[PDB]
Tab-separated table of C-alpha atoms in Angstrom:
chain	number	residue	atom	x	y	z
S	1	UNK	CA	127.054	-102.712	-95.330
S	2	UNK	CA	127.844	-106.103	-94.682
S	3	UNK	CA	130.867	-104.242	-93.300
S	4	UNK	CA	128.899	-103.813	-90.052
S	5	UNK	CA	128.020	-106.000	-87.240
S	6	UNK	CA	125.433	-104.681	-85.444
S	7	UNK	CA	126.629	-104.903	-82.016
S	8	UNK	CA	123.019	-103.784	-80.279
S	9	UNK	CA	119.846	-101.672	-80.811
S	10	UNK	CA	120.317	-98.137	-79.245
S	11	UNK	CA	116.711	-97.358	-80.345
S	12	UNK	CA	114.522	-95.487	-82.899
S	13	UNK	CA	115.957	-92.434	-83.979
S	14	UNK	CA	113.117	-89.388	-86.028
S	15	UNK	CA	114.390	-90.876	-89.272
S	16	UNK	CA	114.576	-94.919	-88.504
S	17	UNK	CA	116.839	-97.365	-86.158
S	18	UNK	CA	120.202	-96.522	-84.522
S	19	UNK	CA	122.261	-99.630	-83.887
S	20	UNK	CA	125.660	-99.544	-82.317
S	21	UNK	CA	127.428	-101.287	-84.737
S	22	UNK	CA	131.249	-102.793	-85.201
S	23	UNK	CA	132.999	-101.983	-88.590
S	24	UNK	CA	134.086	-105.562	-89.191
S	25	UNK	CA	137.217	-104.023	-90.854
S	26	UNK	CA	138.339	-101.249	-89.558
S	27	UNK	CA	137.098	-102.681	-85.832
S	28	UNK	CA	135.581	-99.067	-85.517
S	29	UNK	CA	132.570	-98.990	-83.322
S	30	UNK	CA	129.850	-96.608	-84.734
S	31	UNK	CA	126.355	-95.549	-84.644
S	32	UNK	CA	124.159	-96.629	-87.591
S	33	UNK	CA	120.760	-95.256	-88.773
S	34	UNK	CA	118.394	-97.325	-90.632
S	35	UNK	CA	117.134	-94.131	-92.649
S	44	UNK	CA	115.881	-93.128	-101.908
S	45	UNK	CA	115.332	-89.525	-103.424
S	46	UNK	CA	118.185	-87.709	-105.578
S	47	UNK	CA	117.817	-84.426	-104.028
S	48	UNK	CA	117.777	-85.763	-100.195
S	49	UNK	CA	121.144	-88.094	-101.384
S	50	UNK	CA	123.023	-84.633	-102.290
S	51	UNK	CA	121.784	-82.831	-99.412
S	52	UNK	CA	123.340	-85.600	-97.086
S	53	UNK	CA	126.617	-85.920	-99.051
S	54	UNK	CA	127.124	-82.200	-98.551
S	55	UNK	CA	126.300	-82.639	-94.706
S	56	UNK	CA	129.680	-84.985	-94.938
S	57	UNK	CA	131.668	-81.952	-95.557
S	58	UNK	CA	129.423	-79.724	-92.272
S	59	UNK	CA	132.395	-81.218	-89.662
S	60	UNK	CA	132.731	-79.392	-85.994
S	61	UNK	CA	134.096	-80.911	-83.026
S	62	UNK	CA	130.253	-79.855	-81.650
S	63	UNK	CA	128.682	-82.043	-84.320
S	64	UNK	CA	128.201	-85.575	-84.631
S	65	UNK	CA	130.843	-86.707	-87.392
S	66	UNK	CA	128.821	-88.349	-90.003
S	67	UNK	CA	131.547	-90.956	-91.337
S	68	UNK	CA	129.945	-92.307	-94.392
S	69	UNK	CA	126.450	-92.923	-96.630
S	70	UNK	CA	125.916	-95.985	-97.707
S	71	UNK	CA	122.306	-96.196	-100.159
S	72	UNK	CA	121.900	-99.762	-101.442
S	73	UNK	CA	118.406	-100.485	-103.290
S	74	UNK	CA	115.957	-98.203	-101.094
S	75	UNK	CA	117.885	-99.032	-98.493
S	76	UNK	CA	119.579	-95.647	-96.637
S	77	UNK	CA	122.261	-95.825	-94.012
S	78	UNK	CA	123.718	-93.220	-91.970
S	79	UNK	CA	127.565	-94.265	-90.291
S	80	UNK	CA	127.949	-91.780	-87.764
S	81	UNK	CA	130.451	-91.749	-84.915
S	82	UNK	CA	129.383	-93.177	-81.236
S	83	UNK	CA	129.243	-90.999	-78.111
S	84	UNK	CA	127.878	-93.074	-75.046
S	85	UNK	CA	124.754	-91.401	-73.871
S	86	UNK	CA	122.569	-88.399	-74.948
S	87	UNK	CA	121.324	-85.371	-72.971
S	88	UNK	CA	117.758	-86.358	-71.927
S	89	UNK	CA	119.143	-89.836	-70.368
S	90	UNK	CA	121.590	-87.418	-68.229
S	91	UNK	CA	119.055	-85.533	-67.491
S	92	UNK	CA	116.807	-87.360	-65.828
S	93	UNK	CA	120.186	-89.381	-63.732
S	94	UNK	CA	120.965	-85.342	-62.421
S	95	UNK	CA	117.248	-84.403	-61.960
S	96	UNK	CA	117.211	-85.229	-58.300
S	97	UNK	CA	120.760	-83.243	-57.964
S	98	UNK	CA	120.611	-81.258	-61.086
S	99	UNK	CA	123.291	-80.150	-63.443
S	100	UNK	CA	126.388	-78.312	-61.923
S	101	UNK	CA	126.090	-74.451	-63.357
S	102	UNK	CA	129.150	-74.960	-64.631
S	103	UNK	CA	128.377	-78.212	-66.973
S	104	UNK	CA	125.066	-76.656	-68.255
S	105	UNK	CA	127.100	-73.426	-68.819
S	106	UNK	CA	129.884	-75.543	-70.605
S	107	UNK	CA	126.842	-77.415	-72.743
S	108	UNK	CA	125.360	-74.756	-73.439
S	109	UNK	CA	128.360	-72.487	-75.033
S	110	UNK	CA	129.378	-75.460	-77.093
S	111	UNK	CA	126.171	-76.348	-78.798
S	112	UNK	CA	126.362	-72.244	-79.755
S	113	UNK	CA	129.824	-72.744	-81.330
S	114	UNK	CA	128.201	-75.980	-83.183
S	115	UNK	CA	125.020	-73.542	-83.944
S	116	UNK	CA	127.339	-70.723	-84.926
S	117	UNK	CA	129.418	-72.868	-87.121
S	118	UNK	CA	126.196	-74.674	-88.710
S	119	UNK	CA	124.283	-71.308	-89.356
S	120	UNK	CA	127.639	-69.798	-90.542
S	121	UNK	CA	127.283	-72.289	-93.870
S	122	UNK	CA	123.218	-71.681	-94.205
S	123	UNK	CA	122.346	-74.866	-92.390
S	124	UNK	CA	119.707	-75.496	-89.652
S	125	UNK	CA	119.164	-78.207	-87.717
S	126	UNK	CA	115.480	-76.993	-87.492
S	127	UNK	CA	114.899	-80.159	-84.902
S	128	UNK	CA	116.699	-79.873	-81.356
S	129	UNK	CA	115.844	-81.416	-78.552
S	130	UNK	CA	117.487	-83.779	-75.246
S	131	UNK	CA	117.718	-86.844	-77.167
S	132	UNK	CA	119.577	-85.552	-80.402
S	133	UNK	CA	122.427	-83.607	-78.199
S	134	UNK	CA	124.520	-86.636	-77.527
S	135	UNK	CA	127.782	-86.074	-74.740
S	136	UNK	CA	130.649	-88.130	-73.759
S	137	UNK	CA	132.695	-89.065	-70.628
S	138	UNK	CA	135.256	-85.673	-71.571
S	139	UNK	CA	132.618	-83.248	-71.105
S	140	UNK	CA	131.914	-82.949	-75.009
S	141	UNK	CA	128.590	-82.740	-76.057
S	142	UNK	CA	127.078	-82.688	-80.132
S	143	UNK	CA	124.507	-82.136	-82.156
S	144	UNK	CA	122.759	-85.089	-84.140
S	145	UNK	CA	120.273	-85.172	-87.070
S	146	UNK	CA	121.833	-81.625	-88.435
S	147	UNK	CA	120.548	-80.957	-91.879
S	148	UNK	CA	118.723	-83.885	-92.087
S	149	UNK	CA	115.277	-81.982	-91.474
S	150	UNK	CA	115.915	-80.553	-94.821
S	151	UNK	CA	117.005	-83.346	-96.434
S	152	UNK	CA	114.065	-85.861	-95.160
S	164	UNK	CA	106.794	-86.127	-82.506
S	165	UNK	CA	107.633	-83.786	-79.911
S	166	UNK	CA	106.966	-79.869	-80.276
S	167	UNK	CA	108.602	-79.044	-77.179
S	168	UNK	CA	111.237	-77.393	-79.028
S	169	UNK	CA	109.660	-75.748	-81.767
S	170	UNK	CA	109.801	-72.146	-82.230
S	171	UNK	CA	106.501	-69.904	-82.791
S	172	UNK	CA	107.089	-69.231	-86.259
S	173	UNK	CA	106.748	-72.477	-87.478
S	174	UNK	CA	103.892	-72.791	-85.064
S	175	UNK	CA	102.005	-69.875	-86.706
S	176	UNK	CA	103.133	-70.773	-90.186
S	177	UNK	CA	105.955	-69.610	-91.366
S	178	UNK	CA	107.062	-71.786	-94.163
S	179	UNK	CA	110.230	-69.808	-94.464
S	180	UNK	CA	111.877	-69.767	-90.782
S	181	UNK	CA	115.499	-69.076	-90.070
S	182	UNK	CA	118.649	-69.907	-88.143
S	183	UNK	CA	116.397	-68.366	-85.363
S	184	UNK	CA	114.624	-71.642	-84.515
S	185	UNK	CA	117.515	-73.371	-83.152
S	186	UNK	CA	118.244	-70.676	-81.157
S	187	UNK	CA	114.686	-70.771	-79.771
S	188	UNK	CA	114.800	-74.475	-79.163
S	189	UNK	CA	117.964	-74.084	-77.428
S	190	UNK	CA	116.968	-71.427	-75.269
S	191	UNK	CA	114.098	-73.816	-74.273
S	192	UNK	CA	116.521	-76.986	-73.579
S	193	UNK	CA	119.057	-74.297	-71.675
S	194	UNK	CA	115.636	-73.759	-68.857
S	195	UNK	CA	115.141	-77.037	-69.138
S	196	UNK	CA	118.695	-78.250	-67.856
S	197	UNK	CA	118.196	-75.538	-65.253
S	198	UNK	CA	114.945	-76.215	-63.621
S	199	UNK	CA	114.392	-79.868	-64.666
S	200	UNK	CA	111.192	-79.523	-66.247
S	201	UNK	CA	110.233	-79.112	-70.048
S	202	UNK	CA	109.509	-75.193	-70.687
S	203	UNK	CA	106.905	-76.021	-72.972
S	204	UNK	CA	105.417	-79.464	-72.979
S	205	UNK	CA	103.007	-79.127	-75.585
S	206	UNK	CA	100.985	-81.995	-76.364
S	207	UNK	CA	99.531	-80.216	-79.566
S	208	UNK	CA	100.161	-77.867	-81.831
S	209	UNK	CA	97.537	-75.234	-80.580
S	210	UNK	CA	98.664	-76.181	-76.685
S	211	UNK	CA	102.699	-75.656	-77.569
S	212	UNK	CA	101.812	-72.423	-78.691
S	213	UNK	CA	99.290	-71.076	-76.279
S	214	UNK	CA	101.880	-72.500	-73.246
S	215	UNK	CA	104.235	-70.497	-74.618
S	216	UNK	CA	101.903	-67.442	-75.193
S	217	UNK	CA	101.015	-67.537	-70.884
S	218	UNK	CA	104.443	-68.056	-70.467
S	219	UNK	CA	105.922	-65.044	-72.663
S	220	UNK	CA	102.455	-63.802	-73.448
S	221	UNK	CA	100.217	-63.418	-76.498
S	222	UNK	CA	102.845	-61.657	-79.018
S	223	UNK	CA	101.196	-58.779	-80.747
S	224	UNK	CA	102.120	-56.145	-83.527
S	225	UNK	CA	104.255	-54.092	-80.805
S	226	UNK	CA	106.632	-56.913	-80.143
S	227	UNK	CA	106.602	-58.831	-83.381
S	228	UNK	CA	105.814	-56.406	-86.150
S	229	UNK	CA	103.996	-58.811	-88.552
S	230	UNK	CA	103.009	-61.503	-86.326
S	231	UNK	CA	98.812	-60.944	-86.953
S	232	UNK	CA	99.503	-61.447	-90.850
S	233	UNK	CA	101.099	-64.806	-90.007
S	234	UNK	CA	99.357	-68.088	-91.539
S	235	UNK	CA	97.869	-69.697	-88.779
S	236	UNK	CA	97.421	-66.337	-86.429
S	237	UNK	CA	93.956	-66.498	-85.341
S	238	UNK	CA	92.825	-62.754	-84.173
S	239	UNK	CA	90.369	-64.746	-81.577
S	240	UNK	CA	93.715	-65.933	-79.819
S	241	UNK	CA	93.389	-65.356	-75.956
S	242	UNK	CA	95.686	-62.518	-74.612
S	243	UNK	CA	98.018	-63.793	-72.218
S	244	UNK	CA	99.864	-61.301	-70.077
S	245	UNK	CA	103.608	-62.373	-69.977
S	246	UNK	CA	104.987	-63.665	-67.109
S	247	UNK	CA	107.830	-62.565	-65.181
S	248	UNK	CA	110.896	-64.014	-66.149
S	249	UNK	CA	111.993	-64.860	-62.728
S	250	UNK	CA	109.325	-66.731	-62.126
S	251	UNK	CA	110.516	-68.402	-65.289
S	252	UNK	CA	113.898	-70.175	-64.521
S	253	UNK	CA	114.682	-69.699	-60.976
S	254	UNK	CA	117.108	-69.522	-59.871
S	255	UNK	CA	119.615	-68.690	-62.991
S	256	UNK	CA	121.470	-65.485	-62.226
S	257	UNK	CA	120.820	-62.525	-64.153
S	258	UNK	CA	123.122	-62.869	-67.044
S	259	UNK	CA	121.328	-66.887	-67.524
S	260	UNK	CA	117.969	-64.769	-67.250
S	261	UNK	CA	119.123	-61.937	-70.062
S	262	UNK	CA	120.758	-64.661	-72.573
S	263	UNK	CA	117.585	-66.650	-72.591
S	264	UNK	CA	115.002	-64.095	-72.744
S	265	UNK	CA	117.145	-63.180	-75.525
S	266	UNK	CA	117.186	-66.628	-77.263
S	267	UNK	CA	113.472	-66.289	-76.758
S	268	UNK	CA	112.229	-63.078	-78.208
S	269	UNK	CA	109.282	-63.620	-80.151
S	270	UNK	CA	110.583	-61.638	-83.332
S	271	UNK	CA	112.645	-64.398	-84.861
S	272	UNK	CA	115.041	-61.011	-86.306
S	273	UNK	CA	115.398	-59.920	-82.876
S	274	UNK	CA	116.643	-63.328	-81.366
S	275	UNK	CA	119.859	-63.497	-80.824
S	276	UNK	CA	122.180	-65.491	-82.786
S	277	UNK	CA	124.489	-68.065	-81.779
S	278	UNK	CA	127.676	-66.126	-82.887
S	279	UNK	CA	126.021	-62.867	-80.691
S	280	UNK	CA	125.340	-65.562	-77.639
S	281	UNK	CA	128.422	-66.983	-77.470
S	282	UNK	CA	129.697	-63.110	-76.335
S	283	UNK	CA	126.910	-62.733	-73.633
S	284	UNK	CA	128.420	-61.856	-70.253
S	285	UNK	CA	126.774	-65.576	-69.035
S	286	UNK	CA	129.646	-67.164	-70.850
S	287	UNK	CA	132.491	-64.621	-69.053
S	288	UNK	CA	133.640	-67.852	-66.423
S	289	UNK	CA	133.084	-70.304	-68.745
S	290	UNK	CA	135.012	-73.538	-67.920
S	291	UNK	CA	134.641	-77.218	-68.900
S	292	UNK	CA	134.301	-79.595	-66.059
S	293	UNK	CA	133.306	-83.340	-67.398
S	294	UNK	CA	129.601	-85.117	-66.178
S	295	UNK	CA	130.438	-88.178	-64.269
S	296	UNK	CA	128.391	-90.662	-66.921
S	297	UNK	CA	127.810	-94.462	-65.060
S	298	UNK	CA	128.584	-96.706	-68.835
C-alpha cells in the first residue's frame, strides 16, 4: 500500500475513491479504489482470475485492517465524459458499432463463467486512445444511485435476475450513444419503470408470461400502449433497431444474449476506428 503514490483523485467510484496512483516500484501507473467480509474477499480474488481484453484488468487486492483496495489498470477517460465531448457531433456509427460489439464479447465472456456485472452504465465503461473500451466494477455487485440502467426485473422484484440485465442495460446505453439522451432517466424507482412501460408499454401476461405474479407488480399499474420503435432511436438503421428491441424484450428468457448479439446482422461491417480523446 505504501507501494502507491497517489498521483491525483479521479473521483468517487459506487464502492469508494478512485485515485490515479504511481506504483512506487514497479513505476506502473494504476487506478486505485478506496473500497472487510470473508465471503466478499473470495468473491474478489476469484474476479482476479475473470481477465478479457474487454475488462478492466484488476492487478491486485490489497485488505489491510478494514481497509480494502482495489489496483486496477488505468485507461484515460470513461464513456459518459466522451459522451457528452461528441454530443454536439455525436458518435461516428462506426465507433458506437465498434463499442458496442466489444462490450458483448466482454458480456459474452463474463456470462460464459456465471458472472454479471448486474451494474452498467457510461461511467463504468472506461475507453482508451486505441479505440478499446472495458467494463469496470464486474462482479463486484455481488461481492459488495442511478437506475437508468436497470432492467425491469429487478424493478418488479425479482431477487433472482440473470445474465439478461446486462444485456438490458446495454441495450439502453447502445440508444443512448445513438441519440444522445438517456433512454430512461428515472429519477425513482416507480418513474424508471413506468418510463420504460410508455416507452415499450405496460408488459402483460402475453408478452412476459409471469410478469403479474412478480413481487412488486401492482395490477393498478397504468396500461401504456408501446411506442413505435422508430420513434425510439432515430435514426439507427434497421438491423440497430432489431438488435436493440431484442436486447430489450421484456421477458428476461427472450432477451437476447451477448454470445446471440454478437451474430446479429448489425455487427456484419463491423470495423474499429479509434475516438480522437483530447488527454
Amino acid at each position: 500500500m505504501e507501494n502507491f503514490q497517489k498521483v491525483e483523485k479521479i473521483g468517487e467510484g459506487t464502492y469508494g475513491v478512485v485515485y490515479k496512483a504511481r506504483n512506487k516500484l514497479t513505476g506502473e501507473v494504476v487506478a486505485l479504489k478506496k473500497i472487510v467480509p470473508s465471503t466478499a474477499i473470495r468473491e474478489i480474488s476469484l474476479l482476479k482470475e475473470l481477465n478479457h481484453p474487454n475488462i478492466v484488468k484488476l492487478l491486485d487486492v490489497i485488505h489491510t485492517e478494514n481497509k480494502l483496495y482495489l489496483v486496477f489498470e488505468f485507461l484515460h477517460q470513461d464513456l459518459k465524459k466522451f459522451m457528452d465531448a461528441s454530443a454536439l457531433t455525436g458518435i461516428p456509427l462506426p465507433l458506437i458499432k465498434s463499442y458496442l460489439f466489444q462490450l458483448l464479447q466482454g458480456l459474452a465472456f463474463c456470462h460464459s463463467h456465471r458472472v454479471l456485472h448486474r451494474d452498467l452504465k457510461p461511467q463504468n465503461l472506461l475507453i482508451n486512445t486505441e479505440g478499446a473500451i472495458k467494463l469496470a466494477d464486474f462482479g463486484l455487485a455481488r461481492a459488495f444511485v442511478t437506475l437508468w440502467y436497470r432492467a425491469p426485473e429487478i424493478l418488479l422484484g425479482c431477487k433472482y435476475y440473470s445474465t439478461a440485465v446486462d444485456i438490458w442495460s446495454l441495450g439502453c446505453i447502445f440508444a443512448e450513444m445513438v441519440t444522445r439522451r438517456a433512454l430512461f432517466p428515472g429519477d425513482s424507482e416507480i418513474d424508471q419503470l413506468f418510463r420504460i412501460f410508455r416507452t415499450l408499454g405496460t408488459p402483460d401476461e402475453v408478452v412476459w408470461p409471469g410478469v403479474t405474479s412478480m413481487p412488486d407488480y401492482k395490477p393498478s399499474f397504468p396500461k401504456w400502449a408501446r411506442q413505435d420503435f422508430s420513434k425510439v432511436v432515430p435514426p439507427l438503421d434497421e438491423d440497430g433497431r432489431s438488435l436493440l428491441s431484442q436486447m430489450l424484450h421484456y421477458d428476461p428468457n427472450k432477451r437476447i444474449s451477448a454470445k446471440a448479439a454478437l451474430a446479429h446482422p448489425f455487427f456484419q461491417d463491423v470495423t474499429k476506428p479509434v475516438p480522437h480523446l483530447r488527454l
